[model samples]
Target: MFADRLFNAMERNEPAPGMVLVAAPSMESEDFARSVILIIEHSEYATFGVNLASRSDVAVFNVIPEWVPCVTKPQALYIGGPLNQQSVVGVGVTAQGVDAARVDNLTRLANRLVMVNLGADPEEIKPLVSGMRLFAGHAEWAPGQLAQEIENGDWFVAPALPSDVTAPGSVDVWGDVMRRQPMPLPLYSTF
Candidate 1:
């Protein structure tokens, strides 16, 4: 099964290139509600990445401003699991300075230091960070937990792509990529 294969890969610290981690649609956990995470690092000890914005919920507005021009309110702010929700993290393709002033009122003059709180609306932020680039909250997974989940088919690991990481929202990330995947089962079929 793919899950078992995923477990083996993780055990070996093999990379699932161009893959996205789509949470089970029926998932109800407060921390992972309808969440889809893009896997930046997959190893036996842990899986690290950003959660895709929700597609149906909009409760994050209360905490962060909902406007910055062209951006849309994300369906849900990924909880990044339960361990480290307070730390602010950033992800994106630029690998350099993102236009903080144009989007979230942030500014980066170099590539090493990433700016986390770019203030642009969801819509506007989408294009800027498109293609495997994004900022996220807490990271997911505990020591060996992700490998075990893969062993049980609790999660689906798709190849990682620039879009998988940077796509603005989670509207159809899993579905769209799965449809195009060379594998036989669609992303949602396993669970």
Candidate 2:
């Protein structure tokens, strides 16, 4: 599995590409509680999309052709990230690959396909899409910030499965992703 390979790579001290960051059950931070973070690139900062279902005027779309449902007026609804709570950004795992570059042409983003955005008018967002959810804000990590967090056990690693992305405002989505993973097993002792 891609996740297993990265786990081994981390052990070998390799700077791996992005992976899903699943918060431990006991996580206290409300924003991060039971969160699924998609960490893509890290320069002076590591940008991430939180796998959350809540939103604002910042509603996001599940632009992946496979996951998107029959579009209604509500399809345009999605949440932004931490960096720019009000600023919209397009995010996705495109068939063309994730390195499709930061997109700005609002009209090109359809609710039915994308390879990703946030903050849009009803007419602008109601059209099409790519792979996943919209992120208005992003969780960031500096050069060593993410590594340290991982090493300190503040986070757990998993693959960012495209299938897990769902409609806007799914509160239980975090636990849903956990069931698809094996490592951080949801322990249930026969007490």
Candidate 3:
């Protein structure tokens, strides 16, 4: 029913990897309500958001207290998306020295995407801090799901900025990103 209208009536748009997705004012959905997504992988089969944000019931100290010093910039948890809320995953900003074998999901995000890593001992790992983020989950979108969501006016599309991915208490990061799109989504960013 609505899918037909959305398919035909809606404009065609797509997101590139490392792009930022600002939640449109009207989205109002529970999952995406006031959202900001980092499109990490956008291919024919799937699209994904980095899923790290500033919202959380837990504090930084509870997660990794010793590294707290290295968290010189100290951001929040990376509860990336609705999927796998219990699993923990993270990325920091160092491209060298890490045992690449030990690093899971270690890949570049348009170079801007992959500054790189190595983080075992807290001491060796502390220098890697600065803007490091540890997240619980990540955002996911099937091919048409993301395209259709955009067609239906569910998100505000934008380019990924450095601050958008690295900052902490990160819920506020989305708010700050909102200012970048202050003109309003107008039902579509590409339009």
Candidate 4:
């Protein structure tokens, strides 16, 4: 079937920490369409990510003024996902010398990506990160749900570049990511 072929056409990068989930062209839901999600945690139990494009209504300065200067442009809290709406999820791009493992509040997800603890002191955390994004809630996939979606061609999994995580609000993250894929996947950007 073409549906099965479409899924195989994608690079097939398995979901993992620091990988991205790019919504497929066929996924037209307002909550997920044209969105790029960075996986922060993944396992047989569930998967968790922050939707890099879902900007929320709250401004970062309103709740965490101390972290304002450290965040990328737009400087507002992003809606990581629909669940856990009141919880904060912070993601940061590590500074050149920063090793997330050495930091008490930073959990390294990739070479330059880390999960930040919002409760940590901003002053101490600022210098270790080059850019940051504060998110409210996070995208969650229960058990095999993500695997099912990928197999159905509802998502394209790809390795995330640091820039993809820190892209400006105006940037088309979904399109940009699709364009960078090798061969056939790049052509999907036009769709």
| TM-score (C-alpha) between model 4 and the true structure | 0.92
Against the true structure, candidate 3 reaches a TM-score of 0.68
| Residue 171 lDDT (model 2) | 39
After TM-score superposition, what is the CA distance of residue 99 in candidate 1 from its true location, in Å? 18
Measured by TM-score, the strongest candidate is 4
TM-score of each: 0.51, 0.59, 0.68, 0.92
Instruction: Name the candidate, 3 or 4, with the larger lDDT value.
Output: 4
What value does the lDDT take at residue 183 in candidate 1?
47
lDDT of 2 at 56: 50
Q: Tens digits of per-residue lDDT for model 3 on 108-135?
A: 5543343233244556555443455666
Clashing pairs in 4: none
Please report the candidate that would top lDDT against the real structure.
4
Better of 3 and 4 by TM-score: 4
Candidate 1 yields a Cα-based lDDT of 0.47
Full-model lDDT for every candidate = 0.47, 0.48, 0.57, 0.84
Higher-ranked by TM-score: 1 or 4: 4
